[PDB]
Every structure is written in C-alpha cells, then in structure tokens.
C-alpha cells in the first residue's frame, strides 16, 4: 500500500487537504527513508517535506502521523550534518521535546531517538537541544523506581541519547547540564543490560575526556569501582568504553589516579595487557603509561601487582602503537621511579626489547627510548654500576643502534645519542 512510492506521489499526498492521505504519504516517506540502500534523504529534503513533517509532529489528535513523521525526521537527521541541519532549521527540536511527554510510548521513544541524532551531530546542536529544555523531560522519562520495568529498546535509546548529550568537546557540555545528567547516568551504569552499560560507559568516557575539573565531577559521584567492575566484563563493547574512561581518569591528578588504583584496577591489567584485541592492548598500555607518571608509591603499586613483566612483554611483542605506548610507560617509570624500582625494571629484562625498538623509523619513540636509557644510566651511576649496564647494552646489540642514531636527522636524537656515547661508551 505505502511501499515503493515515488517522491512525487508522496508530495501529492502530503499537499492534499486530507489528513488520512497525508498520513499514508508520510508512512510511504518513512518506508522510503527506512530502506537499506541509499535512502533518498536529499530528494525528500528538496521536495520541501521537512516543514510538513514538523507540522505533523504537532497533530496531537492523530498520533499515527506524529509517529510516522517523527520516524521520517529521525532518519533524515541520521545523515550528514547538512541533512540534520535541514531538520533543525524546520523547527524540529521544540516539536520533538514536546513529543517527549507523549502518552504513546513509541512516539516518545522516536522523539528521544531524533533528539539523539540531532545532538550527535556536534557540540552546537547538542547545546541547542539542551537550550530548548530537553534534559528535564528526558530524565523524567527515567524517573522510575526500577529501570527493569521499562522496555529494553526504550531504555537503550534513552541511554544512547543521554550519552550523545554528554558527547563532543570544543566546547564540552555545559557544567549545569552534566551535573543534572550525572545521577541518572550512575543509575544506568548500575543497570544489567549490556547495551545500556556500554552506552553509559561511553557517556562517562566523554565526561572524563577533559580538564581535571570534569574528571572530578565524575569521580565524586563514586563511579570508579563500578567502572573497574565493568572493566572486568566479558563483553568487549563494555570493556572498551570502561577502559577509555579509566584511562581518562588516570590522566588527571595523582589523587584521582589513586582513586582508580584503590578500586582494584591494576588487577585487571594482566588480561588487558595481553588482550587479543589490539585496541584494548593499546588503551591499557596508555593507561599504564599515565599511571607510571604518578607518584613513586603508585609506581610501587604497579610493581606489586606484577605488571612490569607485562610491560616488558608488550614492549617485546605487540602492535607498534602499543609498543610506543609501552615505551612511554617505561620512560615515565624511569623518570619518576626510585633507584630500586629502576633496577627492578632492569632485572625484569627491559633493556633488550627497549634496544630492539631503537630500530624503528619514528623519531619520537627513539627520543622516548633514549630518555628512558639516560634515566636508567643515572640510576646506575647512583649505584656505581654503570659498567654492568653498559655491558648489558653492548651485548644485546644496542650500542650499535645508538652509534647509528648519532647520524640521525633529528637534532634531539643526534645530541642524545652522542651524549650517551660520550658519557657511558
């Protein structure tokens, strides 16, 4: 009946003075815009149908056309920034916010979805959705004693849209909006559905991707233990955002990093640092690198959890980006660590892989490795064991690589290699 309509027929039906003909044409448009391959979004926009759909959003006496138009506009807004902008320019934001309070669950859900697409466009439309007052009705939809009484898809869409309201930077979401959303976000973070948990973790990862004040806003809500628990989850879609959020948090102050440590995060890193998913290994090694840049007691907790052998493993064999994060972790370790911690690092077998990595082409990893080696040599000097370290480096073939770096294009690598050779070789 409403399958495979032409845009011309849809326009003829929508321009009729007959609400039922308009409803059927709007459903035909929804089905066109809901097809798998290249839905004709631009054709629908050029036909000038967005204002009519927006007007239909307000037909309280005809809920079917409200639903069909909300679906069509959702799918239009799911496209490029220009198509989302076309939806916004038609006045859709306040109409969808008004529909949030609809007595029909599917219409309210579709409005949630549409606002999620609009806000997901970027910071500007995110803040514009916020300015139109979406947060209060959105959160009211979740003001129930037990989230389990809500439909699974409804709750998933609400969580996803809220996560989009927490998303993007330059600027980050308004502080007042974040404070208004965070309690519901914690409650969702304690939900049992895997997709709700994944999207709540993504929202938290967005909110912790910023200055230490945002990280503090998040951590003061007491979510770090739940984040660590989810870090231990089996579902990769949950582990990925949980690990992102934990890394973000440990980029903050040493006290926030210590909050991460106290929750038991380090105990998960034996698996994370050996995870078969390359992205997980890279993110876990980056988190470790930011943890080793902390206090000597935090470096010591890293030691106690037996994670130095795992860092040596990652440095010995892993994707090059993970190996670079591991080199950064080693350099931070050596910069902030005690002489005892540095000699332990050496006893775990760091020198051979660290030297093998000096054959890479990237300059920055070379500089990082040279700085780490300088710090290790300084610790050895303090112990008066510089000759043993020099012999170790010379045996693994590292002295040859250092001499070959003396003729490098970068001035920093040049000078660092020459200084090492002049001081210790």
């Amino acid at each position: 009946g409403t399958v495979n309509w032409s845009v011309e027929d849809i326009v003829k039906g929508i321009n009729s003075n007959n609400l039922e003909s308009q409803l059927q044409a709007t459903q035909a448009a929804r089905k066109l815009l809901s097809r798998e391959k290249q839905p004709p979004i631009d054709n629908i926009i050029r036909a000038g149908l967005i204002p009519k759909f927006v007007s239909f959003l307000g037909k309280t006496d005809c809920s079917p056309i409200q639903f069909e138009s909300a679906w069509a506009l959702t799918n239009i807004a799911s496209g490029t920034s220009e198509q989302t902008k076309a939806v916004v320019d038609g006045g859709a934001i306040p109409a969808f916010i008004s529909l949030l309070a609809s007595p029909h669950a599917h219409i309210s859900e579709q409005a949630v979805w549409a606002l999620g697409n609009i806000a997901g466009d970027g910071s500007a439309f995110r803040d514009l959705v916020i300015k139109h007052g979406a947060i209060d009705p959105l959160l009211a939809l979740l003001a129930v004693p037990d989230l389990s009484t809500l439909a699974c898809g409804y709750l998933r869409n609400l969580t996803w849209t809220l996560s989009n309201l927490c998303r993007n930077k330059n600027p980050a979401p308004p502080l007042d909006a974040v404070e208004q959303i965070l309690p519901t976000l914690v409650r969702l973070l304690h939900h049992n559905d895997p997709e709700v948990l994944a999207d709540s973790c993504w929202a938290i990862s967005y909110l912790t991707d910023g200055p230490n004040e945002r990280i503090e806003m998040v951590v003061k809500k007491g979510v770090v233990p739940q984040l660590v628990k989810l870090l231990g989850a089996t579902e990769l879609p949950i582990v990925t955002p949980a690990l992102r959020a934990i890394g973000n948090i440990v980029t903050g102050t040493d006290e926030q990093t210590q909050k991460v440590i106290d929750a038991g995060a380090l105990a998960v890193f034996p698996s994370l640092l050996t995870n078969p998913k390359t992205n997980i290994q890279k993110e876990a090694t980056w988190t470790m690198s930011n943890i080793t840049a902390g206090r000597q007691d935090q470096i010591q907790q890293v030691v106690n959890h037996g994670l130095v052998p795992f860092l040596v493993g990652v440095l010995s064999k892993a994707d090059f980006k993970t190996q670079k994060e591991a080199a950064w972790a080693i350099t931070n370790y050596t910069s902030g660590g005690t002489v005892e911690q540095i000699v332990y690092l050496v006893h775990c077998g760091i020198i051979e892989p660290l030297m093998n990595l000096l054959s890479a082409k990237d300059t920055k990893i070379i500089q990082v490795i040279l700085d780490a080696i300088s710090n290790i040599f300084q610790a050895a000097e303090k112990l008066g064991e510089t000759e043993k370290l020099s012999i170790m480096i010379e045996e693994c073939g590292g002295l040859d690589k250092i001499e070959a770096l003396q003729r490098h294009e970068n001035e920093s690598v040049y000078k660092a290699s020459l200084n090492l050779i002049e001081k210790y070789f």
């Binding site: 799911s78 496209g79 999620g116 997901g120 466009d121 996803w160």
Partner: peptide, 7 residues
Amino acid sequence: PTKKLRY
C-alpha cells in the same frame, strides 16, 4: 555511534 537510522 553519533547517529543511527531506524530501519
């Protein structure tokens, strides 16, 4: 997952 189309 910035945007999603409803199929």
